[PDB]
């Protein structure tokens, strides 16, 4: 039907625009430098970690929850301990870091603008593998539910499905027309939707290797900055530019609502692991939590 | 009392007026990611010179929109590159994110240009100045940039041209004055006087 989600909470402690976030508590990375670990229910700022490099581009929360990673145009992925000084500084890239995610408490995968995805390790800071091939620079990746595979979206009209253990690609999907800057797996682990600069979320299927659906509407002509499925995957919350977010019916390819209330561009649109509520970043320095 | 620390953080953040540096490889970027914080007139600027990133700039330029002003240093003796530089300026003027922020333009290597002209663009034949030859070439290049500067989006932001040699040391005062003017214009804009 029609979804009428409304602002359950508003977190407004950041000094300037925010660039990313990630659920567990709720971490959020700013431009001023602070990397604040917000409280979701009480809204109290549990931690306010300053950063050596003001220019952040991402942030991660390991599933164990003991570490937090962040990196930006400095090219250095700084990993901090929360049990609050820097634990390590992974440094092997030649371009800005766009997205980093934790496989476990021992290693992290990074997606730099060097047209490569590195598979770092926390113990010694050495690239266990270096996935490469995408002609353009990566902008966003997403680990599979099993963690044995991870997909990455390049600035070319392409995406890839690298395997962490093997160290080699498995498939390539080039159904887009412009840059890819958002991906999130289907919760089952056999398909994934990729937002793009051409303003068309497209859902590729791994088993079939084809674009099953294309969430294209002629009315909207503004690019996508984030995508995210819900718990069951029926909904597809896509965070467009033009200061709005749209929820698509993932199967019917039909519109089902709107999330609005931002005075500037959206830059991350994650959801809770349990699916009890969704979050949303913003360039207005205003995290929001809808439900 | 995290808010207590965040208040001092707000004071420190608003105290520092950021910048950005952009130009060609041969252009004199150094003479005017690398961070170089410097203070003038008891106010601290914290500029940035991004050099480690690849040449594709449609990806990380978008996250330099809170900058107070972009410094654009341009070679003004390498004619072959000049057109390319102009195109870069176009892509900075017309962007949907960098529309608000102004640009401070430096035309580096004026002494080299004088030496070259004393010893590509067909519009130069039908051009007049707004020793004569060197000033004609300088002001022609300046007008070539200002034409695209004032072609569109004049109200939201304005460009500040400057001629800088490779030996002068007055750049800090020039950028200080330009930043003061820019902040004054934003303050007037928020008051609807302009």
């Amino acid at each position: 039907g029609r979804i009428q989600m409304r602002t359950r909470r508003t977190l407004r402690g950041h000094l300037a625009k925010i660039y990313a976030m990630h659920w567990g508590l709720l971490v959020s990375a700013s431009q001023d430098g602070k990397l604040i670990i917000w409280d979701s229910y009480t809204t109290n700022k549990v931690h306010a970690i300053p950063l050596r490099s003001s220019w952040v581009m991402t942030c991660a929360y390991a599933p164990s929850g003991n570490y937090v990673a962040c990196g930006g145009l400095d090219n250095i992925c700084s990993i901090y301990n929360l049990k609050v000084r820097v634990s390590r500084e992974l440094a092997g890239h030649t371009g800005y870091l766009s997205c980093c995610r934790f496989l476990d408490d021992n290693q992290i995968v990074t997606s730099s603008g060097d047209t490569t995805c590195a598979l770092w390790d926390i113990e010694t800071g050495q690239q266990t593998t270096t996935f490469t091939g995408h002609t353009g620079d990566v902008m966003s990746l997403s680990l599979a539910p099993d963690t044995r595979l991870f997909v990455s979206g390049a600035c070319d009209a392409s995406a890839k499905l690298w395997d962490v253990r093997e160290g080699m690609c498995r498939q390539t999907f080039t159904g887009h027309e412009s840059d890819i800057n958002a991906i999130c797996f289907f919760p089952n682990g056999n398909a994934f939707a990729t937002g793009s600069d051409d303003a068309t979320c497209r859902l590729f299927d791994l088993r079939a290797d084809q674009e099953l659906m294309t969430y294209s509407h002629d009315n909207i002509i503004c690019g996508i900055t984030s995508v995210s499925f819900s718990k069951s995957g029926r909904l597809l919350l896509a965070g467009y530019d033009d200061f709005n977010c749209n929820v698509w019916d993932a199967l019917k390819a039909d519109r089902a609502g709107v999330l609005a209330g931002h005075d500037n561009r959206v830059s991350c649109l994650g959801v809770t692991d349990d699916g009890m509520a969704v979050a949303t970043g913003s360039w207005d320095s205003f995290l929001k939590i809808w439900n | 009392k995290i808010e207590k620390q965040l208040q001092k953080d707000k004071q420190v953040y608003r105290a520092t007026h950021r910048l950005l540096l952009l130009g060609a490889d041969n252009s004199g970027k150094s003479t005017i990611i690398f961070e170089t914080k410097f203070q003038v007139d008891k106010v601290n600027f914290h500029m940035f010179d991004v050099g480690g990133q690849r040449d594709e700039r449609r990806k990380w330029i978008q996250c330099f929109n809170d900058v107070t002003a972009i410094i654009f240093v341009v070679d003004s003796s390498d004619y072959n590159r000049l057109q390319e530089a102009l195109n870069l300026f176009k892509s900075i003027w017309n962007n949907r994110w960098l529309r608000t922020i102004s640009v401070i333009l430096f035309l580096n290597k004026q002494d080299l240009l004088a030496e070259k002209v004393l010893a590509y663009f067909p519009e130069f034949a039908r051009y007049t100045t707004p020793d004569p030859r060197v000033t004609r070439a300088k002001y022609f290049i300046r007008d070539e940039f200002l034409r695209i500067s004032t072609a569109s989006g004049d109200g939201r932001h304005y460009c500040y041209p400057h001629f800088t040699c490779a030996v002068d040391t007055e750049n800090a005062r020039r950028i200080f004055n330009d930043c003061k003017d820019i902040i004054l214009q934003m303050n007037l804009r928020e008051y609807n006087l302009v």
Partner: nanobody, 117 residues
């Protein structure tokens, strides 16, 4: 699969896999032994046209959206015009800026025409 062909004086460019009308188009030449150079541009409607200063008024650029083709009409070629001509695409639709048309490793251009007079 965004793929741009090339042929060819009257240089011709065929584009496939995307809507031709939305994206601005450019001709850029890689001269032999030096970096790339931008040769001319044409927008969606064809109203706004511009060329490098060297080739001002000598070449002529025109696009047929119905056939989804682009054409550059080179007249009175000079030996300084020898180069490899590429048919580059603006990287986003409905925008007045093309940021990386002259990048060394751009993704939305593919061609080769070793023009030599």
């Amino acid at each position: 699969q965004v793929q741009l062909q090339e042929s060819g004086l009257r240089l011709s460019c065929a584009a496939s896999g995307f809507t031709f009308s939305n994206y601005k188009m450019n001709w850029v030449r890689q001269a032999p032994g030096k970096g790339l150079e931008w040769v001319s541009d044409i927008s969606q409607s064809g109203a706004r046209i511009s060329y490098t200063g060297s080739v001002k008024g000598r070449f002529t650029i025109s696009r047929d959206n119905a056939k989804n083709t682009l054409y550059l009409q080179m007249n009175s070629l000079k030996p300084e015009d020898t180069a490899v001509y590429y048919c580059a695409r603006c990287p986003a639709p409905f925008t007045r800026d093309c940021f990386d048309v002259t990048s060394t490793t751009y993704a939305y251009r593919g061609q080769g025409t070793q023009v030599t007079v």
